[model samples]
Target: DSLRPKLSEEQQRIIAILLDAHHKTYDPTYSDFCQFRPPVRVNDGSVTLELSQLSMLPHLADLVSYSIQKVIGFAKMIPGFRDLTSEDQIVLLKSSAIEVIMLRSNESFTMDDMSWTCGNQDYKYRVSDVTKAGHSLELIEPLIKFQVGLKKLNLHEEEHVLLMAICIVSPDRPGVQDAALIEAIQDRLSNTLQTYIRCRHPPPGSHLLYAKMIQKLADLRSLNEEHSKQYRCLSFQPECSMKLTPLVLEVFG
Candidate 1:
């Protein structure tokens, strides 16, 4: 139960912040957010408890928006993260919130029944549920694939937690005015991740563990980008009036 990273004091403090922010957040197994609660099976399948599925965007959107709220909480707690300009923080949050939600969703999405088991034995969400929400299988398939791939990594809490931290601190997010400071923070996080992986995973059978984890982050980028693509504002052409609703002006807009 003791897998310690040989981190400096600052690194340790950052991990503590990262870990606590995540640990204290919602428990995937006890989803209390949904107003119209899903059915509870209690793991006795023979009893004919109707398992949840075939729901649509309303439920999914509620879950994700709640997730974004929590992820934003985690972001705000990052050491000196608030030191960045308020605008920078907004850019960072909106840019990466969906990706971070995808990362956090791994904790709830399960493979045994191949559904999102948010209540452990009670309710679950299948890919078809997403499709019912009018989402194409293209996104859901890759999303599930990425989930299981990340699942196979068998990452410890701190490694996974640190990965989320690293994912949020990226310097390349659009609208980033002060990439210099963000880059420095990201570099420090990357180094901490390397040292932790080096010490924790060791050698012998764990070569390139760091690379594998990082490459997963790249996949999340593609996933988020694909997600953003679905929300295009349609009116386009050779220099026609470009437009997006100011109220719904999401990141890529």
Candidate 2:
């Protein structure tokens, strides 16, 4: 008779409301009216929906944005932000700026075994923490040396005002901690794995051929000792390293 863990009083109340809504038998709601697709109820009886696209619902965007603002305001009351020096905030802000840029760009690893390049230059990055709107960390990917000038980062005075605020929004680790980094890593690895699996019996043997490529990158001896040590490259020992391929950059841009 104990269906799941017996629901708490608040949980029971919410369940009743949700059940009532479900009983309406597809009465038109914002999801029905909006062009964006409604969430699908899986066989497991759980609903899966996209969180970022809430703006498709009436007033939901405003509500979520407001909630984010309230939490960030409350977080500012903590002692740490007040204690940090302006210069330190700048360093942290730049790191966060890079993180946001990378997230927006989806500029991680590529499907090809070849590294991601920016002309004759090679680009490599690491992950670390930053601050902005939540407890966050950063994705420190390398930009092309000449590409720095091409960055279209336009920020208002108020937007960049905190500097440290940028750091708060990035993830710290792969799971709950550095979620962004984990997602990025997962995306790259999954593609590599899929490529290997997909080519089960092909002549080329995997379009990406990542398994072997990743092994080569992870090898400590493969990296320049001084630079690798300085950058703490040996710390986690990534399964793969992405460097910009000179041919791709030259041909494309």
Candidate 3:
């Protein structure tokens, strides 16, 4: 009853749609390699690692592009998102894309191995191996930690949808022309999230859970900063021929 009051029919419907889209984009099991795949393994050797990185570049670009488009489409389905100025929409999408991808891609991350699962054969790449092959450990470490923490939370589908919405409609993102409106939308969504948490988790611990979840957003932002640095490293490496797509470049911006 309390949760019903906090979220309107339209908001509920939009959340359902976004959650559906998220599930469609990422499979939780180890059955598929659609978005999550180990680019390199521990004993694969440097030459194999290099080739894996080069060959996976296009797949990575495509995944990023697909996730961004899916997220933007979900955002547009929200009541007021379409009303936001085009500039603001772009700003929000670009600002939140990496974080959303990080959250969605968590399904493939295994805390036990500290590596992303590649396929049903149980193949995996050690985070250490990927870092040793010229990727920044700083970026990979924080991301792994963040994903571990989030998986521990065991967030519900509705909660995940709300978190993504909060990320997308952030008012403090640079170049947002209508901060007041964006903030207003975010406040309503925040309230809905809080109410749902309270009803679902009960008192004495619900508030703490809410705080922890919100903190994950800040953690993701920090991870995104590291991601940008790694992106620059990958883009400028003399021997690396990988080229980032426009969508990915915008997201990394």
Candidate 4:
């Protein structure tokens, strides 16, 4: 209930962008808003969910897989992804996991072992090993199947989903790491937002991103307040303390 008033203008604006993004990526034939509702409810008698246990839900798992598939599709479009050998493709895929999912190098059965050139520079990274050399998609299918099974259980935890979200959005370009890759990741993320909005209509997963962003903002604000208090306390002492600007100012503005 209290959350209604606390939404930042930036958050509101992002939500609006998300809505538009959804409309653009998916077929224009359907309703602008996909059938999925965000797994958020503040109204009376609506099912109140706890974040601590949300990712364990089956529906959330589906959202994670859906996001992952979109990321894979997007990555495949990158020129860098196209040049890799079968083994190299796997390696790149494995490296891509650093941001989103936490896979046990030995256990997850999600194999990605590949090598490639950054323009002319050679680099190698392996997430998992496979005996036969073939397309990386073959390796992805089983893990994705496992992920699909998890979705059927409807777990209710947020952390797993969020971790997967970050992993799915991780970028993999060699030479253009800063500008090109970052922008690519962000572009993929926008598409992710759009895809998520469109796909999860009937049974929406919780608004994990929105909730996490809010919590993160709160933590920053808390840190800022503490720094300010310490600075004020120290200013009156023998040593001068650097002034701390209220973090809330940044958050609000």
Candidate 4, residue 12: lDDT: 42
TM-score ranking, high to low: 1, 3, 4, 2
TM-score of predicted model 4?
A: 0.24
Candidate 1 lDDT, tens digit per residue, 132-210?
4435556778999999999898887888888888889888987899999988888888888887776767453545778
Q: lDDT tens string, model 4, 44-82?
A: 211122222221222222333333343445345433344
Is candidate 2 or 4 superior in lDDT?
4
Instruction: List model 3 lDDT by residue over 1-253, tens digit each.
Output: 3332455675677567667756665546535344443343334435446534454455455556766776777677655687789989888888888888787666667777677675553345556554544565678777788888988887887888778888889999888899999998888788778767776654442267788889999998898788877777776655444444677765674
Q: Write the per-residue lDDT of candidate 2 for residues 79-98, one digit (tens) a residue.
A: 24334445443333333322
Whichever of 2 and 4 has more TM-score, that candidate is 4
Model 3, which residues run further than 4 Å from truth? 1-11, 21-56, 121-134, 202-206, 239-243
> Lowest summed-lDDT stretch of 10 residues in model 2?
128-137
TM-score of each: 0.80, 0.19, 0.79, 0.24
Per model, state how many residue pairs clash.
Answer: 0, 22, 0, 29
User: lDDT scores for all predictions?
Assistant: 0.70, 0.27, 0.70, 0.32
The best-first sequence of candidates by lDDT reads 3, 1, 4, 2
Clashing pairs in 3: none
lDDT comparing candidate 4 with the true structure:
0.32
Off by over 4 Å in 4: 1-6, 28-140, 146-172, 179-253
Which consecutive 10 residues in model 3 have the weakest lDDT in total?
A: 36-45
Q: Candidate 2's C-alpha lDDT?
A: 0.27
RMSD to the hidden true structure, all candidates: 7.9, 22.8, 4.1, 22.9
